[PDB]
Amino acid sequence: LNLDSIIGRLLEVQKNVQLTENEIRGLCLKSREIFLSQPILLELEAPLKICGDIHGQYYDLLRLFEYGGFPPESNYLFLGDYVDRGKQSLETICLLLAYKIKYPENFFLLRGNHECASINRIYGFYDECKRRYNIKLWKTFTDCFNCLPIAAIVDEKIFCCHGGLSPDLQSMEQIRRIMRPTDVPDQGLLCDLLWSDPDKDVQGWGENDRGVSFTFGAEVVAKFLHKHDLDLICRAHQVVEDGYEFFAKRQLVTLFSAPNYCGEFDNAGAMMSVDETLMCSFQILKPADRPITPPRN
Amino acid sequence: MRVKFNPLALLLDSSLEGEFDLVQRIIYEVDDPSLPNDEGITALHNAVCAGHTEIVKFLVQFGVNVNAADSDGWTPLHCAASCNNVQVCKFLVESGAAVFAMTYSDMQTAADKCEEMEEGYTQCSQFLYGVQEKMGIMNKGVIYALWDYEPQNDDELPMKEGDCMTIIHREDEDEIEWWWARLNDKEGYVPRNLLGLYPRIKP
Ligand SMILES: [Mn+2]
Ligand SMILES: [Mn+2]
């Protein structure tokens, strides 16, 4: 398994990239062991860039790295949803897994609700695997997705996860004790961490139109940060018009990194840069596609 | 060690959200409060679009660029007009707004942006069109340059920003967009889209 060769062929579209089935298998197998050798609740330090959903928009992932600096020039934390919907989920996850193997201490992937064999069975990734390779490769990705970490804390101040808060989340130790490999359950802590949404019109825990997990209001955010001495929740999971959106007086931020999501929205993508002093700023991926005096009459 | 957001990002968001208390603090930590985001939107744009009048005043009294244009050429006056917000429209005009500033894709002024089917349309459009009509006639024809201008023709007045001039002759001498003005002891054409009813507030 030659990672420089693999990354080179993936970066050459800077259009499909033809990696071999065994190369892709090796990416899943080596990254899986690294995921299991690190905690399921990551403890990270700034500086780092944090990115939201990509959903197989491979050319936008390259734009993210051009803007933010290709690994290892910058440290990265991705918050999940790498596959499904977009046309190039395979290139997207293969490059992220390749970077994870190259720089396992400077490159980090969180599990999103689409890193799940029940969800990506129907939303595109299963079809992409079957079309370009076979079903057995899709099952290898599942074994690897089942070992992804699910949350991260940056300098004990920024709680990061794909979805959001959970009624079942009383202490960070309940995250740490979730054993891997695991599927995404229908309900409970792991499910909520990958599936829940904030909502300005909800007091407490509301219903979630996805049919999964809950919505949570601004007071839940404030209570969670106060109890755990956190300053910020950083999550993804929802397309937002400007690529990033504040909630609950900037105690929560939603990050979304796929511009013109699904080709249906005109949204921008954003990533958040956290520097060594925890000063946070946003880099925007614009959708890829005196004043002048009058003339004399 | 605490989480903090980029002060410019705080100025834009607090101006959009109506957190006037934060606007007053964070503005002294931004290098240029007129600096826009990645689409040309400034703090004044957000305050005007969201209707936070006290913030609109504060930013304008602070000396921000009352005529900052976005990617489409939208000025704060274009924004106020599209909200049919005649009161903000009048305060901007009294604060140096380029009345005849035009957007790029359509060549429309703020008056053209008033929304036909929303409330406040009659008063807001009649104010702005009325200002376009009586500009250089009312107030003894007194007008103010909002930008510098080195002349491109011999019959054009040089303008410094803030110059106070009198419109001797407008829109009736084969020039609909240039006006014959007097600046001190000289007369000459001036371009209408760089002029205001009142001068800017100095930063
Ligand atoms: Mn998603
Ligand atoms: Mn999601």
Author numbering:
A (entry chain A): 7 to 20, 26 to 300, 317 to 324
B (entry chain D): 920 to 1122
Please share excerpts from the published article on this structure.
For the most abundant of these phosphatase catalytic subunits, PP1 and PP2A (phosphoprotein phosphatase 1/2A), this challenge is met by a large collection of accessory subunits, which recruit specific substrates, prevent promiscuous dephosphorylation events, and/or tether phosphatases to discrete subcellular locations. In mammals, four PP1 catalytic subunits encoded by three genes exist: the broadly expressed PP1α, PP1β and PP1γ1, and the testis-specific PP1γ2. As well as their PP1-binding RVxF/RARL motifs, ASPP proteins have C-terminal ankyrin repeats (like MYPT1) followed by an SH3 domain. Our data show that ASPP proteins use their SH3 domain to discriminate between different PP1 isoforms based on their C-tail and provide structural insights into the function of the PP1 C-tail.
